[PDB]
Amino acid sequence: EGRIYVPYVTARLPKWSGSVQDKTGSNMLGGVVLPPNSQAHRTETVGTEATRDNLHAEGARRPEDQTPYMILVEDSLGGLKRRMDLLEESNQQLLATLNRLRTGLAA
Amino acid sequence: EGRIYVPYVTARLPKWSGSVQDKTGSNMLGGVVLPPNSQAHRTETVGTEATRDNLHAEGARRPEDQTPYMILVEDSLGGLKRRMDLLEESNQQLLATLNRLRTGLAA
Amino acid sequence: EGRIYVPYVTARLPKWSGSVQDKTGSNMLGGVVLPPNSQAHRTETVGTEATRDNLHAEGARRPEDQTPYMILVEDSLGGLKRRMDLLEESNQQLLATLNRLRTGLAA
Amino acid sequence: PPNTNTYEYMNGRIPVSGLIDTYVNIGTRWSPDVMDNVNPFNHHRNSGLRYRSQLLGNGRFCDFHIQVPQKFFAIRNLLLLPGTYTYEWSFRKDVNMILQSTLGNDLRVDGATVNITSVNLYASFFPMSHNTASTLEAMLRNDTNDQSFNDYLSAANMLYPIPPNATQLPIPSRNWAAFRGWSLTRLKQRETPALGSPFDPYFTYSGTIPYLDGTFYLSHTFRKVAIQFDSSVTWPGNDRLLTPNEFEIKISVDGEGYNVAQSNMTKDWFLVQMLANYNIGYQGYHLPPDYKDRTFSFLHNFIPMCRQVPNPATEGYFGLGIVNHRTTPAYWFRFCRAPREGHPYPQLALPPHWDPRHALRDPERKFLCDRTLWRIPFSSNFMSMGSLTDLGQNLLYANAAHALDMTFEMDPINEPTLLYVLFEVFDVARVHQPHRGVIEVVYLRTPFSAGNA
Amino acid sequence: RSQLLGNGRFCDFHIQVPQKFFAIRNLLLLPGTYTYEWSFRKDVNMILQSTLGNDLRVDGATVNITSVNLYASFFPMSHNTASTLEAMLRNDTNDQSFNDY
Amino acid sequence: MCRQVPNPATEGYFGLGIVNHRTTPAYWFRFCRAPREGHPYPQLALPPHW
Amino acid sequence: IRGTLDRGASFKPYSGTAYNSFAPKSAPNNTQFRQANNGHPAQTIAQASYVATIGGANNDLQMGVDERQLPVYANTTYQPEPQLGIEGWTAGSMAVIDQAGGRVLRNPTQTPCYGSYAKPTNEHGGITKANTQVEKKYYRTGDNGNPETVFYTEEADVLTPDTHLVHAVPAADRAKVEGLSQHAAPNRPNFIGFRDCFVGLMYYNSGGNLGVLAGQSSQLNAVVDLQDRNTELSYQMLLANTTDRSRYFSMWN
Amino acid sequence: IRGTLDRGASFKPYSGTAYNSFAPKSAPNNTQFRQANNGHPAQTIAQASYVATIGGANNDLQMGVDERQLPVYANTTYQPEPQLGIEGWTAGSMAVIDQAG
Amino acid sequence: YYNSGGNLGVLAGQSSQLNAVVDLQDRNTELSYQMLLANTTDRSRYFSMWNQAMDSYDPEVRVIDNVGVEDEMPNYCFPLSGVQIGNRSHEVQRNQQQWQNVANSDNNYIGKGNLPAMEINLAANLWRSFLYSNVALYLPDNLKFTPHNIQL
């Protein structure tokens, strides 16, 4: 492709933070505070400063990182993965069928 | 991925327009003037200033927007979609076959 | 998508070179010096200044260009291609099976 | 082979004679849109290259012997005085830079090799009388008579990457003084070797290098250019052009018809080019005198062309599928190359563009201007009234420093390219020779003394 | 000139016609308003040309003018200088003179 | 002007006898002028220079 | 500057070919294919076109009587020559040839006569090749008992430089009857040589290899270059302004 | 000036033709004349030059087996195409075509 | 319009109202302009803007320079085979008889003689085609004749 990352003069950084996306990141005790961006972050909310568990669409503190959310290349990456899985499933079915047929014939 | 859009200092905008791609966009009455870029745009052309319909490779004013053209992530997005469709088709076939076999056996 | 490449103020170029990636590029006589980036490039190495053939993971001077390496959109592009191939293979199998069955029945 | 830069590959690929048969655009002086972005110099009809080739022979192996001249301006026409000097210089060996091929295939992979055995330096001295020669020296050794030269091009070379399919391209930079003018074109990354480094590992090309020989051919791929100082004051402003907010090189939709020369080039751009090259425009447009029309001039390379094509939204004419295209059957071939195949039958491809059987069509204009550079002199009237323009001597610039911002809008291409800009300046240098075997030179390129920061 | 318009029977042209009358070709008008009018033929057999010279008027040859504009380029001469130049060119002793070639 | 020629003291390339020179046979002719004479066959005259 | 140059194998300073350029890009040479396999060994396809020929015995094609009574026979190594043949258009064909002679290749990899070349092996030019074997195959018409056409089969170092296969019918099993259908086409012309004004042969605008030119006593280099400047292009434009950039001057290439 | 132009039907910006320019100026297409009248209706003069062709049943010219067991048939609307044909010069003729189209 | 009192162009100051353009159908502006250009510039180059492309003719057409035709060499066209196939040979051994069959496969193809070819004076044709298309079709109508069975 001959595409030279990265041309764009760089930012110099955010300082105040939360720059990255779907880092996910965790709180205190807490755990699971959602990747900057997403609806949960937009809404001013209360009760998350000092308590664990999930009070958002995504949660439990058990599963992370960097949640694959919305649609990026990753969604295509996630979508691509899904497609691959579907293809694999289809292949299995076919195989099974064939086998059965053979058996029958033999009998 | 932790990829912070967008670092690159921003443009400040084009002003003179037509910046976006495959917006498609429509004319007058017209309709269908092709997304900036593509061969149609490069060629100096006449007859499009005051008349509708398509006098380009892409047309009719019935179908738009933002035509999925050439190859981007979308082509992969389009390509991915095509692949998925193919997989689905393959799955159908298999199923059919199986059914037939079963029937036969029963008989 | 209406995504106006390219907003980011441009680089002005590297000058000293090797900016592009997986260009692959070839040496002298040589041939095959690996796309800037990749492990081979990082390691200071000797014996490549004046001699052909591959003394790297990738080689022979027969195959190039711009090797599809690691994971980019291309890997998805490569991955997508692989998925498509798999789907095609699955479809073939199915077909075969069907045919066989039919034959049997007839007999 | 895998390498698409190999001779075998370019010699194996089979093109379809259908895409360019004796009936293509019958009746026009139009060039295939698929070739407008293809280096026309990398052709086997390049008299220039073909000459040098035979100048060495027809054999693969050949013991050459040439004379290389000095091109560095600072010392080209210099007149050294008595004394001894150390004159050293390096020479490349990269076949892909010293050699050139019509196809531009990677010579480095096609077994292309060169070898230098010996190198000598010749110098001719005028048999000038010692008496006179002595007097001349005495004078040339006075600071009041120091020799001074200046690169002919005189301009800082800049290169900005243009991502594939990109359309807009902004470029930030700032000059503390006043230069002469702008000059620019467009080059293909693959055809541009990364200079500065004693070797380019990613340079798999051997065709003509527009960046050096000056074989440009992508100036017809620009739409508009916008210049602004201090990110606010547009230049030239003052409502000079029909479109005071920018320089529209070409328009797609006529609208008003700011196009001239029966092409797609605006009237404003045409005027500018004429003034910056022949100072012609304020008193009628006429073919300038021959001595001013060199291979690197504008008009000399300007070639407008038009053609009509069957309008797609006219009637049920359908799409002439290249896989169904049949013309001169039984005498033609689908993979067009092999012998004759088919059966005599009334063809169908290529719809009529005349005669009572003519179907509704549509006009299409464009142009080409190769081996040339777009100019935008930094003068109040765009005319050349001296090396040191008037604006380049205006207090507004010499007094305070400003910031520059240009925005180039060009046609999308399916490959990495570059925006070759040329900030015309004053690259002058004085040579002072006080004593025997002593050379003191003083360079000075303003603006852009030593880069920008 | 033929190919300069295209190869199609139908073609939307766009040209620039210069002034040929000597009395006003290289004339140098001064500030003020003037009425500049002129007519244009439409006879295909005079505006157009053919290799065979066949009667175009009978061979279905037709032309149509949609719009016509007048362009004029002025030198961005300083008002101070331009003013002086005018003062001089307005004296009978400096009247411009031309002559058909 | 320059040109390369098969060096006579290189390898066993022998001397291309003008009386044995055959190129485009059956379409060519020994006294080259009259009609076509011979039979299509891999020629030999003029050694490769690349 | 003096030295050796190797344009490589990709150097083709011309279009078309220099080997049987008038030969149809489909017409094959004397190939002895095989009849779709089975139990049909060999199979000749050629033409015996040699000047008359008194007779033809076990020895071979008689070229005369070697001055006097003793009948002379064609020298296998080069006779008959694929150049020779009857002189009469109709007089030659209408007269009919009782004893004809030709030369043919046996079991080689078929290749269109277009651009076919081989290396010589004798003062006779003949391309007999390393294999000393040569077979004088006698043919009849089917009911007559006499060598109407004598063929001197041989193997050649057949190859193709300025030509490639434009149409390859079968991949493998090529040397069969269906293979001769293959066609050839000349390789694209590729000229190679030193650029204009030898641009690039010398380093310019590169701090890495900046040229030096100073007095031994001064030691202070008078050549200050910047990778920002462009000497190469500068020189080009300069010439196009002082002279007619259309003429040629070998010295400066 | 801007407008529309109609070069008429007498406009031919080129020599020769753009339709079967290699076709003999005497060789006719697939014509089905009549035999000097009498009681001889129709009469075909042409040529069947199509790539092999497995067979030929009531359906039409078989172009293969449409992937698998079912034999595919040429689409009347455009098959066979007057562009297709055997690849071999002698190999094609010497082999003989049993089923031509 | 030029030199036509019927459609004389106007160019006068609104205040003056006195037309400054006085034309006479006796003068010829058109031609005058032509000659003018051929004296100040090279009337051989082209300039789209003014559609300036002086008319000219091919020197070889105006004055025929029949220098003959270089056709010392005969040109031939050979079959796509390189030899017409029509008969089959049969490699047979002598002695013991009159000549015994080979048995090793049969039916070959050998042409006794040269390759059947057709001749055509290439260079000649081109010369003739040139003439007829550049001077024959342009001869005065008086030297022509209406084709056979054709409505005109």
Side-chain angles (χ1 to χ4, degrees), chain B residues 44-101:
Chain B
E44 245 138 297
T45 301
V46 66
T48 157
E49 269 213 12
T51 221
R52 77 134 51 178
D53 312 12
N54 96 247
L55 3 51
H56 285 331
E58 241 175 38
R61 218 15 238 310
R62 202 358 71 252
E64 314 303 328
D65 84 14
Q66 63 271 9
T67 39
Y69 82 167
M70 55 68 142
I71 314 333
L72 169 65
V73 226
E74 332 341 278
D75 155 337
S76 348
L77 285 112
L80 295 173
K81 293 178 179 180
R82 294 181 182 175
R83 294 181 181 175
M84 294 300 292
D85 290 342
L86 296 174
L87 296 174
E88 295 177 346
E89 295 177 346
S90 63
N91 289 334
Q92 294 178 331
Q93 297 179 332
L94 298 176
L95 298 176
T97 66
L98 298 176
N99 293 335
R100 296 182 183 175
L101 299 176

Side-chain angles (χ1 to χ4, degrees), chain D residues 131-188:
Chain D
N131 184 192
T132 300
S134 183
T135 303
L136 181 62
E137 170 183 54
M139 297 182 274
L140 296 178
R141 289 187 176 299
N142 294 301
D143 57 58
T144 180
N145 299 298
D146 288 310
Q147 304 178 60
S148 60
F149 310 72
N150 68 304
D151 188 61
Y152 182 59
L153 184 60
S154 291
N157 307 293
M158 315 303 255
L159 293 176
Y160 308 71
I162 311 179
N165 299 181
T167 308
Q168 182 178 62
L169 193 177
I171 54 178
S173 298
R174 64 175 174 300
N175 58 67
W176 59 86
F179 59 176
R180 295 168 57 221
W182 287 283
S183 185
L184 164 155
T185 309
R186 185 174 183 177
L187 310 177
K188 292 185 177 181

Side-chain angles (χ1 to χ4, degrees), chain D residues 46-72:
Chain D
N46 181 178
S47 181
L49 181 62
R50 181 177 58 179
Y51 178 59
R52 291 120 68 179
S53 176
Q54 302 179 302
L55 189 56
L56 299 176
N58 62 302
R60 172 180 177 176
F61 304 109
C62 60
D63 301 302
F64 64 71
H65 184 176
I66 57 181
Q67 297 67 59
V68 183
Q70 180 56 295
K71 302 183 181 182
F72 197 54

Side-chain angles (χ1 to χ4, degrees), chain B residues 11 13-17 21 37-49 53-56 70-71, chain D residues 37 165 167-168 224 246 251-256 259 263-265 311-313 362-366 409 412:
Chain B
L13 244 237
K15 165 99 171 200
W16 52 259
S17 142
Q21 337 209 58
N37 61 197
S38 252
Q39 294 9 326
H41 252 21
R42 113 179 8 206
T43 259
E44 245 138 297
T45 301
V46 66
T48 157
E49 269 213 12
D53 312 12
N54 96 247
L55 3 51
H56 285 331
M70 55 68 142
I71 314 333
Chain D
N37 301 292
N165 299 181
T167 308
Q168 182 178 62
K224 58 185 62 180
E246 54 185 57
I251 302 179
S252 182
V253 290
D254 56 60
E256 158 55 64
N259 297 17
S263 63
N264 64 303
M265 181 179 276
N311 178 297
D362 181 298
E364 213 173 67
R365 299 170 179 285
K366 73 173 186 181
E409 183 180 299

Side-chain angles (χ1 to χ4, degrees), chain D residues 52-108:
Chain D
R52 291 120 68 179
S53 176
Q54 302 179 302
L55 189 56
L56 299 176
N58 62 302
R60 172 180 177 176
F61 304 109
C62 60
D63 301 302
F64 64 71
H65 184 176
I66 57 181
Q67 297 67 59
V68 183
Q70 180 56 295
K71 302 183 181 182
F72 197 54
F73 75 115
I75 63 177
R76 179 209 295 295
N77 310 297
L78 178 55
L79 184 58
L80 288 59
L81 301 175
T84 59
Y85 315 71
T86 175
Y87 191 48
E88 175 184 297
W89 218 288
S90 299
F91 302 70
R92 294 191 181 67
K93 295 201 301 178
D94 179 64
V95 299
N96 293 292
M97 289 205 85
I98 303 179
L99 304 176
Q100 177 182 300
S101 64
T102 56
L103 284 58
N105 60 301
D106 181 296
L107 300 175
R108 214 173 309 173

Side-chain angles (χ1 to χ4, degrees), chain I residues 37-58:
Chain I
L37 296 178
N39 179 58
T40 59
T41 63
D42 178 293
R43 206 68 222 297
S44 180
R45 248 189 302 178
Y46 300 121
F47 185 57
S48 62
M49 168 168 258
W50 294 153
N51 191 65
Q52 179 181 182
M54 166 169 256
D55 303 298
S56 62
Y57 51 66
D58 184 298

